[PDB]
Amino acid sequence: AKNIKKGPAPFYPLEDGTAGEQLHKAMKRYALVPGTIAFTDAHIEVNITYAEYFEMSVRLAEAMKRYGLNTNHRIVVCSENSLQFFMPVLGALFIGVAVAPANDIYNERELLNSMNISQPTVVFVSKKGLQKILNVQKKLPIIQKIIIMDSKTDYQGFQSMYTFVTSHLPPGFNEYDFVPESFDRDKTIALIMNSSGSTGLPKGVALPHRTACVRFSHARDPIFGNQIIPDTAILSVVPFHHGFGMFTTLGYLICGFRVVLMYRFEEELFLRSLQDYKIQTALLVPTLFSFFAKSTLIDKYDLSNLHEIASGGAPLSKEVGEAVAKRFHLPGIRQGYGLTETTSAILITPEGDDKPGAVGKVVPFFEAKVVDLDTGKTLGVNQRGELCVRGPMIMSGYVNNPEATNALIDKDGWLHSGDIAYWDEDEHFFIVDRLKSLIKYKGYQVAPAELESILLQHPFDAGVAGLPDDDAGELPAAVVVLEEKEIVDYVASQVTTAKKLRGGVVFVDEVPKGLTGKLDARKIREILIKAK
Numbered sequence: 001a002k003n004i005k006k007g008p009a010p011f012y013p014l015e016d017g018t019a020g021e022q023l024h025k026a027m028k029r030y031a032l033v034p035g036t037i038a039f040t041d042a043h044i045e046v047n048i049t050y051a052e053y054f055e056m057s058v059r060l061a062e063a064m065k066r067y068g069l070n071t072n073h074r075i076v077v078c079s080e081n082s083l084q085f086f087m088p089v090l091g092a093l094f095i096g097v098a099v100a101p102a103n104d105i106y107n108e109r110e111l112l113n114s115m116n117i118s119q120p121t122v123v124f125v126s127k128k129g130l131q132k133i134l135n136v137q138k139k140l141p142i143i144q145k146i147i148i149m150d151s152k153t154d155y156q157g158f159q160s161m162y163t164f165v166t167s168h169l170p171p172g173f174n175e176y177d178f179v180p181e182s183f184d185r186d187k188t189i190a191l192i193m194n195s196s197g198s199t200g201l202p203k204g205v206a207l208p209h210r211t212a213c214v215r216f217s218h219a220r221d222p223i224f225g226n227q228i229i230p231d232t233a234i235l236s237v238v239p240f241h242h243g244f245g246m247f248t249t250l251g252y253l254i255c256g257f258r259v260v261l262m263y264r265f266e267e268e269l270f271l272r273s274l275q276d277y278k279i280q281t282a283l284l285v286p287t288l289f290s291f292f293a294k295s296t297l298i299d300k301y302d303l304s305n306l307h308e309i310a311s312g313g314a315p316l317s318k319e320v321g322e323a324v325a326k327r328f329h330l331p332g333i334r335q336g337y338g339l340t341e342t343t344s345a346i347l348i349t350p351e352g353d354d355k356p357g358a359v360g361k362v363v364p365f366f367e368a369k370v371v372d373l374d375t376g377k378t379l380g381v382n383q384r385g386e387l388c389v390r391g392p393m394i395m396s397g398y399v400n401n402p403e404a405t406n407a408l409i410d411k412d413g414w415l416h417s418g419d420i421a422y423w424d425e426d427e428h429f430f431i432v433d434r435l436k437s438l439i440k441y442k443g444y445q446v447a448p449a450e451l452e453s454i455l456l457q458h459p460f461d462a463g464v465a466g467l468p469d470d471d472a473g474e475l476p477a478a479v480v481v482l483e484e485k486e487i488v489d490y491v492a493s494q495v496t497t498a499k500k501l502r503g504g505v506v507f508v509d510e511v512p513k514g515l516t517g518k519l520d521a522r523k524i525r526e527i528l529i530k531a532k
């Protein structure tokens with residue numbers, strides 16, 4: 001039992017009611033404080049207040065209700081990050097309609113797969129994503145209505161959220177007398193998120209309202225989240241359609257924070273925005289740390305108010321993290337680790353309990369352990385195995401896929417992450433890598449991160465994978481973005497014999513990786529397999 005790591009009691013208690021009720025209540029309070037800003041588009045320098053956000057979301061909620069949407073229905077939200085993104089999200093949560101965000105850069109096959117799973121009756125989509133939706137809806141007769149998110153007028157023959165609302169709301173509708181729907185928060189689905197899909201096509205991850213309600217505890221937790229304090233602004237550059245961006249942003253709204261967003265990253269827009277908006281917290285993914293590592297523009301700006309930079313969703317090398325923290329005059333980088341299937345982060349760096357390299361400690365309400373791959377036995381301190389976690393943010397299941405659900409989550413509620421991890425004498429957790437990413441040369445384990453960090457030492461980017469053999473099983477190899485034998489012999493001079501770059505090198509102009517910064521191990525393997 002000493003080998004089960006447990007979250008402590010929460011510093012902010014779990015709240016009663018559906019996630020919709022909790023968001024409604026908080027945002028109505030902020031709405032009544034004049035000038036409170038909920039979202040800011042840093043690209044166009046436009047703000048929207050809580051009063052405006054609250055009022056439009058409630059109008060969208062009532063309209064959707066009058067349209068006939070209820071807990072038997074799903075909507076899709078398909079959009080890049082924007083001021084409008086969370087309007088249909090909140091509207092739907094207020095009335096118990098399940099929300100299925102669809103990645104806005106999905107190709108048509110991926111997009112069709114996602115909506116085939118969520119089976120939406122109504123699709124909310126940005127101007128930019130509209131055509132992809134049209135290109136696949138023929139195969140999805142479930143869809144009865146398409147609404148454009150980021151237009152005020154009708155747009156290409158489709159209603160916008162504004163004209164939709166106006167065609168279903170009484171003109172004398174009072175937003176402040178609206179009452180959100182009450183329902184069973186364990187049974188009623190809040191979100192249907194898409195999984196990563198290592199085993200192929202993504203799945204639909206169903207998240208009861210309860211898991212959002214537990215997130216809101218973590219979010220308001222002064223130690224595992226961010227204490228509610230007026231005039232707090234966050235700069236977020238994380239995709240809203242992904243678990244990382246979805247449940248941080250809903251938390252920030254519950255906290256009454258100003259969420260400063262950007263539809264795409266640019267170094268200077270980011271840095272000026274930190275300054276001019278007096279940002280207290282920047283929420284990043286690891287891939288962006290490259291730009292900030294070399295400094296450049298940083299020390300020009302007044303970042304007096306920056307308290308923390310938080311990373312998640314992918315590995316962050318200890319070196320880069322420490323380097324970037326130093327430049328920003330921060331003690332370190334705050335981490336969070338989670339999976340779509342755990343709703344949000346369930347390992348988080350507690351305030352004042354930092355340890356370089358660690359992704360943090362088990363959050364309140366949760367437990368974690370690491371197990372033997374061969375027998376499933378619980379392992380002890382410093383022993384690497386598969387990270388398993390359990391707690392009330394674990395998904396209720398993959399939509400219409402009970403087999404995959406049971407393959408992931410066992411009878412005691414443990415979710416099997418597919419990550420190799422260990423914990424230390426103080427209960428800090430370290431992520432080694434995805435198990436499927438590990439390289440096995442003649443029986444010995446080789447972790448790509450160590451070879452990558454070593455290749456990064458040479459005076460731009462790189463990805464390490466296992467080139468198959470026949471005797472060795474795999475040989476450590478790398479694709480490298482420049483700023484072969486020169487690299488190979490350099491590596492062999494930094495590591496032990498078992499983890500030398502016998503696989504070779506393949507030069508590319510870009511290392512394949514996902515939105516949140518996870519390397520595409522499969523694509524990198526194909527690149528090496530073709531070349532060498």
Ligand SMILES: Nc1ncnc2c1ncn2[C@@H]1O[C@H](COS(=O)(=O)NC(=O)c2csc(-c3nc4ccc(O)cc4s3)n2)[C@@H](O)[C@H]1O
Binds near residue numbers: 244248313343345419
């Ligand atoms: N911090 C991390 N370090 C190393 N690896 C990390 C990681 N986080 C996710 N991963 C990897 O992503 C995989 C899952 O990817 S995923 O399914 O797309 N889902 C996610 O990546 C995911 C879902 S929720 C979430 C986070 N929420 C947060 C809230 C606050 C905060 O400060 C930090 C975070 S991260 N991440 C994991 O299995 C793991 O391999």
